[PDB]
Amino acid sequence: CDIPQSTNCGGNVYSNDDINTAIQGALDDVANGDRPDNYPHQYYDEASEDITLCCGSGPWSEFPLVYNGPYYSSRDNYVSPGPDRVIYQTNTGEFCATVTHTGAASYDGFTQCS
Numbered sequence: 001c002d003i004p005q006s007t008n009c010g011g012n013v014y015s016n017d018d019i020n021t022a023i024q025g026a027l028d029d030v031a032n033g034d035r036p037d038n039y040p041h042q043y044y045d046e047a048s049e050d051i052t053l054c055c056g057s058g059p060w061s062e063f064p065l066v067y068n069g070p071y072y073s074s075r076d077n078y079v080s081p082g083p084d085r086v087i088y089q090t091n092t093g094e095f096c097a098t099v100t101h102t103g104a105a106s107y108d109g110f111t112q113c114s
């Protein structure tokens with residue numbers, strides 16, 4: 001669906017530009033064969049997490065959502081992905097949701113950014 005104007009991931013509020021930058025980064029990094037710290041990852045629906053997607057069918061991917069992005073890390077300069085993620089449709093790039101580890105119900109779980 002359209003990228004939202006903003007999203008609140010456990011207190012980190014991001015803009016549409018931050019979200020777009022994250023997806024664009026993921027797509028470029030996959031194309032470049034240089035997936036920073038091996039992101040993107042696959043995202044699977046796990047309904048206990050109460051995360052709605054607005055993009056349609058999977059497959060879905062997730063990539064770190066950061067300020068002043070895109071997220072990048074390398075063997076010579078590790079950077080944490082932090083807690084926040086964009087979810088997008090792997091085959092197209094289209095936006096699905098933003099999620100976070102912050103405040104999730106279980107270890108390594110995600111919860112929806114609001």
Ligand SMILES: Nc1ncnc2c1ncn2[C@@H]1O[C@H](CO)[C@@H](OP(=O)(O)O)[C@H]1O
Nearest residue numbers: 041042043044045046049062108109110
């Ligand atoms: N719905 C979901 N919830 C949490 N993790 C998920 C997920 N779908 C896939 N994952 C995967 O599980 C890791 C967390 O242990 C995630 O990596 P990150 O926490 O983003 O580093 C995904 O690879």
Ligand SMILES: [Ca+2]
Nearest residue numbers: 050051052112
């Ligand atoms: Ca929800």
